[PDB]
Structure 1
């Protein structure tokens, strides 16, 4: 099972940041620039990126899978054009997880016409536990998290066989 729920509503959780300009040509939809459905790529809202601070207390009775991303721009100019804070940091924490991320600004080889990178991270939050996101830039925040229920007897198979 999997219950997709909105961990951070788009219209209420980010009042100080722009949640509408985080689209790229590496993820096109019908020719238009788009992004992932479960993630929001926050940018500055007008020459300013105030410190981001959000928390989620797991009030569900079971385990929650939470996904986020860290962006590494190719240039310092791009870092300022997106976040306006050359020295930026991300901090993600739970009762067992705690990690600090710093951007790695460098020019990578172009794959999908992009010189920067996006690292994707996941965690499992137990019932009664909380997750905390702090940032001054370079965070791709969650939008949808997955409440998950476990039972043995499933798996992943790779097959070209048709389904009937």
Structure 2
């Protein structure tokens, strides 16, 4: 989808996420002398000892298609879910006026990849002009920090190992 358009225009929208600690990260992924996290995503954790139901609205009043990237966190065990979220069983639901997609978080053990034993599933949702994006979840929700423009062109992708001259 992005290789057909060929752009990385990350327009930072005015997302409103209240009652939730933002900019969460880990010790394995570092940015400089300190720790780091994803720059295009926002890892949502608990805010103290209270994690309420999140409700956002993203209207599309432009003349181009929007592409949002949201993730579902998969902890390694039940101890990681209770330490990052208040509710032990979350559910991520991202729907629009023409589509509806719900991804259930799956608690399970993962192999040792880059020191960590946890992963995150990635699912996308394309918003049409005139649609309103409603993202409501009760746990394991990763919030997007922007979107991309779905341009129409003759672009593609190609795996290669040759140098550029």
Backbone CA RMSD of aligned residues? 1.8
What is the alpha-carbon distance in structure 2 between the residues aligned to residue 115 and residue 2 of structure 1?
30
> What is the DSSP-based 3-state SS (H/G/I as helix, E as strand, rest coil) of the residue aligned with 1:79?
helix
Q: Which residue of 2 aligns with 1:157?
A: 158
Q: 1:46-104: per-residue Cα shift (whole Å, max 9, x none)?
A: 11111111121111211111100000111112111111101211111012321222221
1:60 aligned onto 2:62: yes
1:3 aligned onto 2:13: no
1:98 aligned onto 2:103: no
> Deviation at 1:31?
4.7
Q: Give aligned pairs, total.
A: 159
Q: Which residue of 2 aligns with 1:86?
A: 88
What is the alpha-carbon distance in structure 2 between the residues aligned to residue 36 and residue 68 of structure 1?
12
Q: TM-score, normalised by structure 1?
A: 0.87
Contact 1:71 1:119 in 2 (8 A): yes
1:16 aligned onto 2:25: no
What is the alpha-carbon distance in structure 1 between the residues aligned to residue 122 and residue 87 of structure 2?
21
Gaps of 5+ in 1: none
Contact 1:7 1:142 in 2 (8 A): no
